[PDB]
């Protein structure tokens, strides 16, 4: 990339977009883990019902 002021502004915009994407992906991962910790409890209950 040729060094110009416009390219510098474009690169800083890309950096801001990457940081926002990281912050959004962390929230998505947290939601997935929140669902997982209830799905595992349902599986645990069904496993011991199947035993009886």
């Amino acid at each position: 990339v040729s060094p110009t002021r416009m390219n510098l502004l474009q690169r800083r915009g890309q950096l801001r977009l990457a940081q926002k994407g990281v912050d959004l992906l962390k929230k998505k991962r947290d939601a997935l883990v929140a669902e997982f910790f209830g799905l595992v409890r349902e599986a645990m209950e069904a496993r011991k019902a199947l035993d009886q």
């Binding site: 997982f36 595992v40 599986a43 645990m44 496993r47 011991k48 199947l50 035993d51």
Partner: protein, 104 residues
């Protein structure tokens, strides 16, 4: 659907409608499982815990080409009567899934 277990409960599952097979060793159960897998049809197989603790390890390369078939570990005849606690299965599964192994 089919099941591989002890011969007594296998014919009970056959009464219930599953193509059950009797076995008491891991090698014959794995061979019959991979014999059932290769042909299209039913994708559900149930194995006792005394024959194959890890059903995915036996068909790990066929599962890489297709994740559709379902293999479910289950308790045996003697295992059911003596009983156990199912928390160990959850403790292993959480390590299998997220690696951190910790679940209070």
């Amino acid at each position: 659907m089919a099941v591989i277990a002890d011969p007594e409960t296998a014919q009970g599952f056959r009464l219930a409608g599953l193509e059950g097979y009797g076995a008491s060793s891991a090698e014959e159960a794995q061979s019959l499982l991979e014999t059932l897998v290769e042909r299209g049809g039913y994708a559900l197989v149930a194995v006792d815990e005394a024959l194959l603790p890890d059903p995915e390890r036996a068909v790990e390369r066929l599962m890489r080409g297709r994740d559709l078939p379902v293999l479910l570990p289950i308790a045996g005849l003697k295992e059911a009567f003596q009983g156990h606690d199912v928390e160990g299965y959850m403790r292993e599964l959480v390590r299998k899934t997220i690696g951190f192994d910790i679940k209070l």
